[PDB]
Symmetry: C12
Subunit: 146 residues, 12 copies
Amino acid sequence: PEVASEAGAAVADEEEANRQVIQQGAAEGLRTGAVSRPEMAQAVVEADAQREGVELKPQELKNRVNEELTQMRTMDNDDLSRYVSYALIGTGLLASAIDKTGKAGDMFAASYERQLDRNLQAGINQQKMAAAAADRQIKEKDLERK
Amino acid sequence: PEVASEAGAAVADEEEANRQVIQQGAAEGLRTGAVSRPEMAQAVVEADAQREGVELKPQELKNRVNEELTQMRTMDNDDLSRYVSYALIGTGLLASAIDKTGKAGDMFAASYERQLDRNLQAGINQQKMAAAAADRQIKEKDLERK
Amino acid sequence: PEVASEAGAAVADEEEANRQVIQQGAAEGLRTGAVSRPEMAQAVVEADAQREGVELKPQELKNRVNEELTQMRTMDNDDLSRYVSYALIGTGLLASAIDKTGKAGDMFAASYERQLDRNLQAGINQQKMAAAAADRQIKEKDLERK
Amino acid sequence: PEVASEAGAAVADEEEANRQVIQQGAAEGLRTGAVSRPEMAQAVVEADAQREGVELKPQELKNRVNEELTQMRTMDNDDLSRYVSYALIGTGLLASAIDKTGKAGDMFAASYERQLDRNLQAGINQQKMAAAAADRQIKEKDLERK
Amino acid sequence: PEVASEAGAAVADEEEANRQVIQQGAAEGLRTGAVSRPEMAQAVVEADAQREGVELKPQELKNRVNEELTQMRTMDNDDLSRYVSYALIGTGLLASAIDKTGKAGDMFAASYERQLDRNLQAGINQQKMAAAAADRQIKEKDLERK
Amino acid sequence: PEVASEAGAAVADEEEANRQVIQQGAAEGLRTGAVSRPEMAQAVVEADAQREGVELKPQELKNRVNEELTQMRTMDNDDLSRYVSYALIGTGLLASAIDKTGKAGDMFAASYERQLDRNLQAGINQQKMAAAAADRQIKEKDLERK
Amino acid sequence: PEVASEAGAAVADEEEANRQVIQQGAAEGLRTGAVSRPEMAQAVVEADAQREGVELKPQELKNRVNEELTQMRTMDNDDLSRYVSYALIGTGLLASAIDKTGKAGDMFAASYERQLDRNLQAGINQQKMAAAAADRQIKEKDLERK
Amino acid sequence: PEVASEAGAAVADEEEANRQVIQQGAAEGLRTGAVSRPEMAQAVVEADAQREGVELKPQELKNRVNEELTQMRTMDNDDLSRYVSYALIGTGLLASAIDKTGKAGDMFAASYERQLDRNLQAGINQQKMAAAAADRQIKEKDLERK
Amino acid sequence: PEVASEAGAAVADEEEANRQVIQQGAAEGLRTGAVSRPEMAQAVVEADAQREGVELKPQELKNRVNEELTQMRTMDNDDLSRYVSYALIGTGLLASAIDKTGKAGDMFAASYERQLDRNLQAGINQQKMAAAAADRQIKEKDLERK
Amino acid sequence: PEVASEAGAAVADEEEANRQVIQQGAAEGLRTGAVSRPEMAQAVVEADAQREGVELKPQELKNRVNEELTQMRTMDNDDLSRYVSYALIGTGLLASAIDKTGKAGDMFAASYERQLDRNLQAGINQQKMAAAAADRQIKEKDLERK
Amino acid sequence: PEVASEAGAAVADEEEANRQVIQQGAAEGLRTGAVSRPEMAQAVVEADAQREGVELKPQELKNRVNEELTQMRTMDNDDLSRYVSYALIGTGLLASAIDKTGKAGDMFAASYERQLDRNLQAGINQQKMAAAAADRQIKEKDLERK
Amino acid sequence: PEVASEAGAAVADEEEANRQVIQQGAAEGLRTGAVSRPEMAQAVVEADAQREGVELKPQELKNRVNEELTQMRTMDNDDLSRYVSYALIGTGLLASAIDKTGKAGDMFAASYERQLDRNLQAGINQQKMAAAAADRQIKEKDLERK
């Protein structure tokens, strides 16, 4: 019946929206320096521990914070925002013993490689050596004055 | 019975009157710089999305604003006001299962070609090289003093 | 019966008084610049539209204002006041299905003819070159001293 | 019966008395310049119109004021006072279908020719060249000292 | 019976006593200039009119005042006081249909010729050249010192 | 019976005592100049008129005052006081139809001629040339020192 | 019976004591000038008049005062005090139709002749030339020092 | 019985004690001049008069005061105090018809003789020429130092 | 029985104790001059008179005071205190017809010649010429230093 | 049954959590000098005595404090914190007569060997002489500029 | 029975203790001069008199004070304290007709003998000439430095 | 039963603890000079007297303080603290007629020779001449820099 509609309302509405809000917030926090990398490393570690439902022992908690930090050092600010959003929002698996899992999974996929395809489309980079474009602009302005 | 009167009262009265008010306001705001182009682009995108009745995902929403701005960059201020008025007021289609649709549609078309014919009649612009008119004025003034 | 008395009372008195008061007010306002020409043009256009009982759309309302301004530009202040008074007070036609229209119309024509004939009698213009009159006054004063 | 006494009390008492009070008041107003000629011209015009019981239409009301002014310009201040008093008090004609008319008429007459004969007796002016009278005064004073 | 006593009490008591009081007052007023001649002329004219019991019209009243002033211009201050006293108190004639008129008339007469012969005895004038009196006084003083 | 006692009481006691008191007061008034002669002339005239019981008319009242002043001018201050006292007090004649008039009158006489005889005895004045008295007093003083 | 005791109580005491008090008071008044001679002359005159029980008329009252003054001028201050005391206290004569008369008279006598005999005894004055007494005093002082 | 005791208590107790108190007071008053001789002369005269029970007429009261003063001028201050004390306290004679008179009289005599013989023992006078006593004192002092 | 104890408590307790206190007070008063000799002379005289129970008359009171002063002048201050104490406290004699007599008397004696014998033992005076004692003291001091 | 969950709760929850917290606190206190070594020596001695349940006498208490200080002097700060944490945390032995002892012991030993093996893995120390690393970094930056 | 305890409590408890306290107080008073010798002489005399139960007459009271003073002059301050304490506390004799006197007296004697023997043991005085002891002390210090 | 436990709780708990507290306090007081030696001597003497239950008479009390101080002069401060602690806490003997005495005695012993061998082990004294230790420290430091 309404399985697809309920799945969309419980997936598309309040899963990727908060994810993108978190992404932009983390990007701003990195940019202005208000919140530093170790804070997010610790937050990710606590989130993963809560996901596993195991109380974290303080000393190796510091150990996980450290290994997460050295893992994250090899990524830039925007990749860091992507990682943080995915980690703090990453959920799913299965609940109860009913349907609606397959539709949720397929739209998770749709959104996922939709994100990767915009990544490829935005990584095409800019062209031109930025000196011929000046010549073209000069030529158009010359046609305007003439 | 009163089908034509109802159509006129529900079309000519408060459909293009408000549209015309928004056209004037948008022209004034663009002229004085109170409201910028991106605000109008965002408003148009939100209005279109509400018309389609689909909740807008923020990121490709930014993409819609971007491509809409690229679309608008090739239009002047008055054409922009026309576009915004039409987009923010553009409605119609059919409601219920009754008459009055045909008269509404034909007077939409009438007002539309009315707007285009004023555009053509205003586009005739001005003539003369603005030096013979001075000679004409001098001649009339000479006739007056004479 | 008393139909002629009603014609005179409600058709010879209670608007030509207002007509001449409006004439005086418009003349004074134009003379002192308190009210400009576009204000009167707009008022005349609204009065005509209300007489026709049709709601007025904005840009062609401006179009009527402009063509009325072009019409007025070939008229002086006094003629403008006359025209404005006539337009603002001009009424008549027929009401109900009774008498009293014929005398109303004929005495309207009588008042109008009086207005034009007194206009001509005022426009007969002054004479004399204003140098012989000085000689006549000098001669009379000489006879007084003598 | 008492028609003559009632006639005298209704004419000789409160007809000429007010007339002469207005005469002296108008003379004083002319002399001191407190009230000007056009005010009295307009007052006379309104009084005549009220006597005729016809409402005066404003424009030709100004016309009557003008013709009254150019009629009055050929009279001096005292003649102006006479004219104004007569115009503002001029009444009479007939009332009811009874007596008292003839006595009123004859005393109106008597007062009239009384005013004219006083005017003639006052218009005899003065005589003598005003140098012989000085000689007579000198002679009398000489007889006084002697 | 008491006819003579009543006549005396109604004549000698409060008829000429008031007259003499007004004579004194008028003499003092003229002497000090507090009251001028035209005021008494107007008072005399009003008193005479009230005696005749006829309401006085304004301007002919002015000419009565005028000829009365011309009359008094031939009289000195004391004669003027006599005249004003007589005019303001002059009464008499007859009342009712009873006696006491003859006695009143005869004592009016007696007082009148009493005023006349008092006037003559005052007007007998002084004598002497005012130089022999000095010689007489010198002679008496010489007799005293001797 | 007690007729003589009553005559002595009311014809001798408060009828010369007040006379002498008035005499002394008048003499003092003349000596200090507080009250003048015309005031007593007027007072005497009013007293005489009241004695005659006749109301006094103004100018002949002044006439009696003036003739009384002329009468007084030939009298000195002391004689003036005598005359004033007599005039202000002098009474008598007869009352009722009873006795007591005779000894009252002869006692008035006695007092009168006793005033005259003391006047003559006081009018003998003084003797001596006022130089022999000095010699006599010198002789007495010389006898004293011796 | 007790007639001698009553005589002593009401006669021998109660005027001679007051007489002597009056004497000393009059002497002091003369000495200090507080009260003058004419005051006592007038007081004596009034006392004598009251003794005679006759009211005094003011003028001859002044006459008695004057004759008393010229009578008193020939007496010194102490004789004046004696005379004044006797005059203001002098009483006696007879009362009722009983005793108390004769012994009153004889003790008045005794007091009187006692006053005269002390006057004679005090009139012996002083003796000696007031130079031999100095010699006697010198001699006694010489016997004292010796 | 107690006749002698009563006499002593009524004589020796409050007769001489007060007498000697007045003696001391009079001596002190004369010594300091607080009270003069004439005051005590007057007091003595008044006391004697009261003892005789006769009212004193003022003038011969002064006479007795003067003669008493002449009597006292021949006595010194202490004799004067004796005299005044005796005079102001001098009493005695007889009262009632009982005994106690003889004892009082004999003790009066005893006290009197005591006063005289004390006076003599005080008046035995001092001896020596007041130069041998100096030699005696010098001699005693000589044996004192030796 | 207790008669000897009663005598001791009535004599030795409050007779010589107050006597010695009085002696000390008198000695101190004489030493400091607070109380002079005549005061105690008068006090002793009054005490003796009160003991004799006879009222004291002023003069011979002064005589006893003077003779007591003469008696005291031959006594020194200490002996004066002894005498004053003895006189002021000296009492005794006999009362009623019972015991308290012999023991009181002979203990009075015991105290009396006890006072005399201590007087003699104190009057043995001091010995030595006050120069050998200095030599003895010098010798003892020399023995101390040695 | 649930002996394993109770084992984890009673071994890993609040047993080495407080141990590691105490480790951190002791390390910080030693680093900042807030708490000195003798304080922890005394605390350790008191904890051991309380574990043995024997009251400590003063001097040998000082003796244990001193020997514990000697024991600590051969240790650095970090291992001192380790020892202190073990001292006031180390507990165990057996309670009641039930299970849960074996799991407690074995996973106590598990955490223990974990602590030593991580100690050895952290004690592997750093390598390189710190001059070749600079060369490598220089080469990498050269490749970046190139 | 408890006779020994009663004797000890009422003989040795509050009898020598207050005696020694009195000794200390007297010694301090002598040392600081707060209380002088004559005060204690008088106190001792009064205490002895009260012991004999006889009232002391003031003069020979001074005599006993003097003889006590000359007795005490032959003793030093500490012996004076001994004597004063013994005199002020010295009691004993016998009371009632019961036992407890004998051992009271013999241990009185024991305490007295203790006092005298400790005085002898304290009077053994110090030895050495106070120069050899300096040599011994120097030798000991020399042994110390060496 | 609990005899040993009762003995230990009544001896080891509150006998040596208080004793050693007083030892520490006395050592501190002697070190800082707050409490002097005579105060401790007096306290010890009073405690001993109270233990003997005999009231100490003041003078021989001073004797005990004196020779007690002479005994104390041959001991140092720490030996003095030992002595005062033992004297002020020294108790024991036997109470009631029950057990627990032997165990108390043997633990008194145990504590006693525990104090003795602690004293010996503290008095084993230090070794070395304090110049070879400097060489040893220099050698170790040289090995460290090497």
